[PDB]
Amino acid sequence: KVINNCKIDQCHAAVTNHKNWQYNSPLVPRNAELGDRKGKIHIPFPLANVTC
Amino acid sequence: ENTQLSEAHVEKSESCKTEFASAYRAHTASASAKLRVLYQGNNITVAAY
Ligand SMILES: *[C@@H]1O[C@H](CO)[C@@H](O)[C@H](O)[C@H]1NC(C)=O
Numbered sequence: 001k002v003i004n005n006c007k008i009d010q011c012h013a014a015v016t017n018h019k020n021w022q023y024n025s026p027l028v029p030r031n032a033e034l035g036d037r038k039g040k041i042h043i044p045f046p047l048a049n050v051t052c
Numbered sequence: 053e054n055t056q057l058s059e060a061h062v063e064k065s066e067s068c069k070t071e072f073a074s075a076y077r078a079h080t081a082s083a084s085a086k087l088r089v090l091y092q093g094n095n096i097t098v099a100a101y
């Protein structure tokens with residue numbers, strides 16, 4: 001698209017359509033006030049007793 | 053006129069099933085003993101409260 005009679009740095013643009021899921025790290029903003037859940041993954045490597 | 057919202061809470065660690073300490077109240081103890089007896093030229097053993 002072309003917008004006539006307009007200067008750079010008077011507008012804002014972003015990419016909005018995504019098809020994949022991302023971990024909700026505290027370093028990224030929330031998508032909406034109340035977030036929706038899509039799935040979960042497990043943490044490997046449990047503890048066990050051994051000898052030294 | 054921007055704002056930011058933050059929150060947190062506290063939970064219990066998963067590792068508590070293996071690494072923990074416990075407190076007890078103590079009461080009167082029981083006692084037992086083990087003896088050796090030389091009798092009729094042979095060794096026998098007994099155990100009793
Ligand atoms: C061994 O692990 C179990 C749980 O998996 C725990 O209850 C127990 O106290 C452990 N024993 C030792 C000696 O670490």
Ligand SMILES: *[C@@H]1O[C@H](CO)[C@@H](O)[C@H](O)[C@H]1NC(C)=O
Nearest residue numbers: 088089090091093094095096
């Ligand atoms: C068992 O009896 C023998 C005698 O038959 C004795 O010499 C020995 O000392 C006794 N055992 C113990 C541990 O005292």
